[PDB]
C-alpha cells in the first residue's frame, strides 16, 4: 500500500541497499532532534539539488537499524513517499485524494512510519494550489499534532516560494539547513563510496582520484553541487572503464572533458602562457608578456581572498582579451563587452547593474548572476569607459575592492575570478592592478598572413583556388589600418578584396 | 460483418452515391503509396475541416471501382468504420470487445478490405474504457505488429492532440497532407460537381457562377 509510492528506507538499510554517509551526522542528529519532538516533528531538509538530503535520511534509516536513535525513533520505517507519483495517473475528481488517504491510513495503522516527502514544495499545489483541497490541506491537521512524522526535503528557493508563502504550512515544518559540503568533506564522502564503486564497476580507485573528483568539480561545474557532481565524476570514470583497472586523475579529467567540454588540465601552462596567447596575437608582444606577467602572480603564488584576478587598463586590444579568455579556463566565449560608450546618464547607471524593483529594466540588467558567476572564470571588458557618467563607475569601486556586485534584484555577483579590463579620478585608477600600453608596417602584414590562413584553410578544402602574393599583403596593410585610428578592422579589408572576388571564380 | 458496423464505400462508389472529385489525383495516389510502405503503412489524412479529406478516400473508392487502381489493391473494398454503430447496443459485458474483434477478423478472413476510420482522433481515448480496454487499444497491436492497415482522417489540430501523443502511433501512421485547393483547383472541383447540383436543384449553373463561387469564397 505504502510500498506503491516509495521504498522502505529502513528495510533497505538492513539489507545494505543504501550508500553509507560519512559526515553530515550533525545534520542527522538535527533531524532526529526534530523527529523526537511532540507537536511538529516534521523536519524539512533545506538544501540545493545534490548536496545530500536523501542521503541525510538515508543515514537516518541506517541509524535506526543500528539502534543509534532515540526511543521515539526506534523501529521506525522510512518511506520515500513521492507525492508526484500521487498526482501521476490521477485524471479524475477525488482520484488524487483517495491514494493519499490510503497512505495516511497506513500511518494510523502501523504507527511507526516516517514519510520522506522529497520535493516538499510540491505539497502546495497538488489539488488546487490552496484554492481547494490539495495534499497540503490534507496533511496540515495531522502534521500540526505530531500524528504524522514527515521529513521534507526542498531547495531553499522552493522553501521560500511555496512553503514559506503558506504561513500555515511553514509552522508544521522545521527547517534543517543541509549545506553544500566542502571539498575536503566531499573527499571523505567518496572514501566510503569506494567500496560501493569497486564492487559494481570492477575498478580500483586510487586516493587522489577522489581529490581530483571533488576539487575539479568545484572548479569547473557550478550548475551541479558538491556531493553529487563528484560522485558523477567517479561514476563516469568507471564508464570509461566499461569501455576498457585503476583510475587516474587524468581519468577524471577525461570525464569532465566530456561533461563541461574543456580539455585543458596550472604551473606548467602558466609559465609558457605567452605562446598560447601568441597563437591569436602577433605584433605588439610587449603587452602580451605584460598581461602574462601579473597573472603569473595571481594564479601562481600569493593572492588576496577579496580581489579580481587581475585588473587592466588598455590604453589588438579586445583581440588580446579574447585570447586571454581562451587561456583562462578553455573557452573563447567568456569575453563580455559592456560597451560603456552606450551609457552617459545617471539614470542609465541602473540599466547595466540592475533596476530597483518596480522600475524599468528589472531584467535588462540584473542578469549578471546568470552571466558572470555562472561561468567559473570570466573576462569582462568595459569598452570606451571614458564615455560613461562618473556615477556608473562609482559602482565599479565595489568590485575593485572586494569583487562583489549587488544586483538590482538583490543578488551578490562575485567578480573575484573575473579579469576586469577597462579600455580607453586617482581613486579609480590605483585599484586597477595594471596600466598596459598598446603601441600602434611589418606588424600589420604578419597579421595579414595570420588572418588569411584561417580563411584559406577552409577554401582549398572545398576545392577552391588559392592565388596569393606577398606584395598584395602590403595592399591589405594600407586599407585595413589607420594611424589616426587603429588597423581599420583588417578583416573587413580581407572580405573586401578576397571574398568579393571569391564569387568571381565560378564566373 | 463490416456492413453492419460501417458502410461499404466502394459499393457506394459503384452505386454512384459518392461525389466525384475532379482533380485530387496526386493525393489519392499518395494514399496508395503510403499504404504500400512497410513501416508507416497507415495513411492518416490531415487537413483543415472542409478541404476534402473524406473526399480523398471517397475518390479512392471511385478509383477502385473505375479500375484506376494498382492490382495490389484492385477490388479492395473500402469500408468506413462507423464508431457509432460499433458502440451502439454494447449493453452487455464484452460486446464492444467482441464486435471490434469481429470486424478485425473479418478483415483477415477475406483480405479484400482496406479500412477507413473517419475522425481517427475519436478512436483514441473512447469506446469502452471503464472495465474493458477501449477502441484504440484493440486497434493498437494490429497497427503495431501489423495485421491491419487503416486509412485515417484527422484535423491537422486533432492530429497533434491525439495521434501525436504517443510515439508508438507516430511510427506507424503517415500524415498525408490534404491541403486547401487553390481557387483554380476549386473551379475544377466545382465544374466536376456541376452535374450533381444541376440534377438536384434542376437548375443550370454557368461557368461564371463556378469562378465566382471559388473566387468570392
Amino acid at each position: 500500500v505504502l510500498d506503491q509510492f516509495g521504498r522502505n528506507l529502513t528495510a533497505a538499510a538492513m539489507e545494505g541497499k543504501l550508500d553509507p554517509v560519512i559526515g553530515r551526522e550533525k545534520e542527522i542528529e538535527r533531524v532526529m532532534q526534530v523527529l523526537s519532538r511532540r507537536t511538529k516533528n516534521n523536519p524539512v531538509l533545506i538544501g540545493e539539488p545534490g548536496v545530500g538530503k536523501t542521503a541525510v535520511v538515508e543515514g537516518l534509516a541506517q541509524a535506526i537499524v543500528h539502534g543509534e536513535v532515540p526511543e521515539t525513533l526506534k523501529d521506525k520505517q522510512l518511506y520515500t513517499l513521492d507525492l508526484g507519483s500521487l498526482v501521476a495517473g490521477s485524471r479524475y475528481r477525488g482520484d488524487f485524494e483517495e491514494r493519499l488517504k490510503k497512505v495516511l491510513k497506513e500511518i494510523n495503522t502501523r504507527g511507526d512510519i516516517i514519510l520522506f516527502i522529497d520535493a516538499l514544495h510540491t505539497l502546495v499545489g497538488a489539488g488546487a494550489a490552496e484554492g481547494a483541497i490539495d495534499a497540503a490541506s490534507i496533511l496540515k491537521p495531522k502534521l500540526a499534532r505530531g500524528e504524522l512524522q514527515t521529513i521534507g526535503a526542498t531547495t531553499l528557493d522552493e522553501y521560500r516560494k511555496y512553503i514559506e508563502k503558506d504561513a500555515a504550512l511553514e509552522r508544521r515544518f522545521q527547517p534543517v539547513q543541509v549545506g553544500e559540503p566542502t571539498v575536503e568533506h566531499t573527499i571523505e564522502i567518496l572514501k566510503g563510496l569506494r567500496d560501493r564503486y569497486e564492487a559494481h564497476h570492477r575498478v580500483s580507485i586510487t586516493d587522489a582520484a577522489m581529490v581530483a573528483a571533488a576539487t575539479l568539480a568545484d572548479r569547473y561545474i557550478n550548475d551541479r553541487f558538491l556531493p553529487d557532481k563528484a560522485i558523477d565524476l567517479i561514476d563516469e570514470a568507471g564508464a570509461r572503464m566499461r569501455i576498457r583497472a585503476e583510475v587516474d586523475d587524468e581519468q577524471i579529467a577525461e570525464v569532465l572533458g566530456n561533461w563541461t567540454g574543456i580539455p585543458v588540465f596550472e604551473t606548467t601552462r602558466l609559465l609558457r602562457m605567452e605562446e598560447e596567447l601568441h597563437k591569436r596575437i602577433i605584433g605588439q608582444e610587449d603587452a602580451v608578456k605584460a598581461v602574462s606577467k601579473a597573472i603569473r602572480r595571481t594564479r601562481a603564488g600569493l593572492k588576496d581572498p577579496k580581489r579580481p584576478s587581475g585588473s587592466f587598463i588598455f590604453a589588438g586590444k579586445t583581440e588580446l582579451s579574447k585570447a586571454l579568455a581562451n587561456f583562462l579556463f578553455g573557452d573563447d566565449d567568456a569575453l563580455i563587452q559592456i560597451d560603456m560608450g552606450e551609457f552617459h546618464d545617471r539614470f542609465t547607471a541602473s540599466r547595466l547593474f540592475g533596476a530597483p524593483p518596480g522600475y524599468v529594466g528589472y531584467e535588462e540588467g540584473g542578469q549578471l548572476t546568470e552571466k558572470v558567476r555562472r561561468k567559473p572564470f570570466s573576462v569582462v571588458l568595459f569598452d570606451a569607459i571614458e564615455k560613461a557618467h562618473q556615477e556608473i563607475y562609482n559602482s565599479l569601486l565595489q568590485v575593485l575592492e572586494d569583487g562583489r556586485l549587488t544586483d538590482g534584484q538583490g543578488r551578490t555577483v562575485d567578480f573575484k575570478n573575473t579579469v576586469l579590463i577597462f579600455t580607453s579620478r586617482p581613486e579609480f585608477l590605483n585599484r586597477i592592478d595594471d596600466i598596459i600600453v598598446f603601441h600602434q608596417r611589418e606588424e600589420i602584414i604578419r597579421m595579414v598572413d595570420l588572418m588569411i590562413s584561417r580563411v584559406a584553410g577552409q577554401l582549398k578544402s572545398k576545392d577552391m583556388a588559392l592565388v596569393l602574393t606577398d606584395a598584395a599583403k602590403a595592399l591589405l596593410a594600407k586599407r585595413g589600418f589607420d594611424p589616426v585610428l587603429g588597423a581599420r578592422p583588417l578583416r573587413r579589408t580581407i572580405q573586401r578584396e578576397i571574398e568579393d572576388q571569391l564569387s568571381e571564380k565560378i564566373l | 460483418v463490416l456492413d453492419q458496423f460501417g458502410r461499404n464505400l466502394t459499393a457506394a462508389a459503384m452505386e454512384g452515391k459518392l461525389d466525384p472529385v475532379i482533380g485530387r489525383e496526386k493525393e489519392i495516389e499518395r494514399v496508395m503509396q503510403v499504404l504500400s510502405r512497410r513501416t508507416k503503412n497507415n495513411p492518416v489524412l490531415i487537413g483543415e475541416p472542409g478541404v476534402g479529406k473524406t473526399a480523398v478516400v471517397e475518390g479512392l473508392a471511385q478509383a477502385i471501382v473505375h479500375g484506376e487502381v494498382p492490382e495490389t489493391l484492385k477490388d479492395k473494398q473500402l469500408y468506413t468504420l462507423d464508431l457509432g454503430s460499433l458502440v451502439a447496443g454494447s449493453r452487455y459485458r464484452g460486446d464492444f470487445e467482441e464486435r471490434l474483434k469481429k470486424v478485425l477478423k473479418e478483415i483477415n478472413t477475406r483480405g479484400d478490405i482496406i479500412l477507413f476510420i473517419d475522425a481517427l482522433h475519436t478512436l483514441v481515448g473512447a469506446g469502452a474504457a471503464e472495465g474493458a480496454i477501449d477502441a484504440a487499444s484493440i486497434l493498437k497491436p494490429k497497427l503495431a505488429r501489423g495485421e491491419l492497415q487503416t486509412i485515417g482522417a484527422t484535423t491537422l489540430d486533432e492530429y497533434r492532440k491525439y495521434i501525436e501523443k504517443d510515439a508508438a502511433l507516430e511510427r506507424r501512421f503517415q500524415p498525408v497532407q490534404v491541403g486547401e485547393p487553390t481557387v483554380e483547383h476549386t473551379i475544377e472541383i466545382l465544374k466536376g460537381l456541376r452535374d450533381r447540383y444541376e440534377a438536384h436543384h434542376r437548375v443550370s449553373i454557368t461557368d461564371a457562377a463556378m469562378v465566382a463561387a471559388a473566387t468570392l469564397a
Binding site: 490521477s90 479524475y92 475528481r93 477525488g94 482520484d95 489539488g127 488546487a128 | 471503464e130 472495465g131
Partner: peptide, 23 residues
C-alpha cells in the same frame, strides 16, 4: 515605475464523470 501583470491562468478542472456499466 513599471507594472508587473500577474496574468492569471485558467485551469483544466480535474473532472468527475459518469461511466457506463454493463451486466
Amino acid at each position: 515605475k513599471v507594472l508587473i501583470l500577474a496574468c492569471l491562468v485558467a485551469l483544466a478542472l480535474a473532472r468527475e464523470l459518469e461511466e457506463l456499466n454493463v451486466p
